[PDB]
Design a protein around this ligand. Structure first.
Ligand SMILES: *[C@@H]1O[C@H](CO)[C@@H](O)[C@H](O)[C@H]1NC(C)=O
Length: 320
């Protein structure tokens, strides 16, 4: 029984990578985002009034293992806000069935959520980021002692699979070379320490230290406005006008962008962030978590990442 489950993901235009999870007995299948940036799991309930219309609704009277809770919770995002109440039931993810407390969403905003191919979220975060300190699912599936190693990996594919999360190990057919691990700067968050950004073979941003949160939930690579407009400057630019847009003739032409992460240099070439829209955006993130950089999808695409709970580090390997 020393396990490894695999969940294959759908790639909704390099911006949304999502999966399927089953909730209850028997399972209601939901499409969800796996997010190292959040710590609560939520889905819309059949108690929902808006964009409830458009997504699968969780219905407790079809589950033999539901044990209601009812406590409120409002989960707030840089994009959304959602609220409901706490429910309890059985989640099934790639063949791990764990008993989870999760929020049954009763109010969803009609704009960001309407055009979201996903129904809810499973956060891959630390108990410390949990609203209500509801034991996040990974602490919980580790408690069950079924996995090979208390690590989970992610493959984000370029828009034949779309992507893939492996719990308990890593998938060698999808990375090449070897992992180099960087340690969490402080537990509670999946954040490492960055030593600069070479926006050339020369520019240098954060030639000091700056923080970098490894966030699966994020679609782009982000930095603070301040930081991001110096970087966009020394590159091609064209401020705003539906978000940092450059010349297409000189796309191939743009320089490399390198992150100095614990020793090695992680560089992405023009072809990894130029779509013409650029895959880099700004997002001043507030204390506690901000001010930080956010290596989201755009980064993962290029680097297969391993999040290690037993040693609280992050390893990366060349994706393939
Ligand atoms: C439900 O869950 C919370 C966990 O935050 C617990 O404190 C609360 O008492 C529970 N409610 C009941 C009635 O089970």
């Amino acid at each position: 029984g020393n396990t490894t489950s695999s969940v294959i993901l759908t790639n909704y235009m390099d911006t949304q990578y999502y999966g399927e999870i089953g909730i209850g007995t028997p399972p209601q299948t939901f499409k969800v985002v796996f997010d190292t940036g959040s710590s609560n799991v939520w889905v819309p309930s059949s108690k929902c009034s808006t964009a409830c219309v458009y997504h699968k609704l969780f219905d407790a009277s079809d589950s033999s293992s539901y044990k209601h809770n009812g406590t409120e919770l409002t989960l707030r995002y840089s994009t959304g806000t959602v609220s409901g109440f706490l429910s309890q039931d059985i989640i099934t993810v790639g063949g791990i069935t764990v008993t989870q407390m999760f929020g049954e969403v009763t109010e969803m905003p009609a704009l960001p959520f309407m055009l979201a191919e996903f129904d809810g979220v499973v956060g891959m975060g630390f108990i410390e980021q949990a609203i209500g300190r509801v034991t996040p699912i990974f602490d919980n599936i580790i408690s069950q002692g079924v996995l090979k190693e208390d690590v989970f990996s992610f493959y984000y594919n370029r828009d034949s699979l779309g992507g893939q999360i492996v719990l308990g190990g890593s998938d060698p057919q999808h990375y090449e070379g070897n992992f180099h691990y960087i340690n969490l700067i402080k537990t509670g968050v999946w954040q490492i320490q960055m030593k600069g950004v070479s926006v050339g073979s020369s520019t240098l941003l954060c030639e000091d230290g700056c923080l970098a949160l490894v966030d699966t939930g994020a679609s782009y690579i982000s930095g603070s406005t301040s930081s991001i407009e110096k970087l966009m400057e020394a590159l091609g630019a064209k401020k705003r006008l539906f978000d940092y847009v450059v010349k297409c003739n000189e796309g191939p032409t743009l320089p490399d962008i390198s992150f100095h992460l614990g020793g090695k240099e992680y560089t992405l070439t023009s072809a990894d962030y130029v779509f013409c829209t650029l895959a880099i955006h700004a997002m001043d993130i507030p204390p506690p978590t901000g001010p930080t950089w956010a290596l989201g999808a755009t980064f993962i695409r290029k680097f297969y990442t391993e999040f290690d709970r037993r040693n609280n580090r992050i390893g990366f390997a060349l994706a393939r």
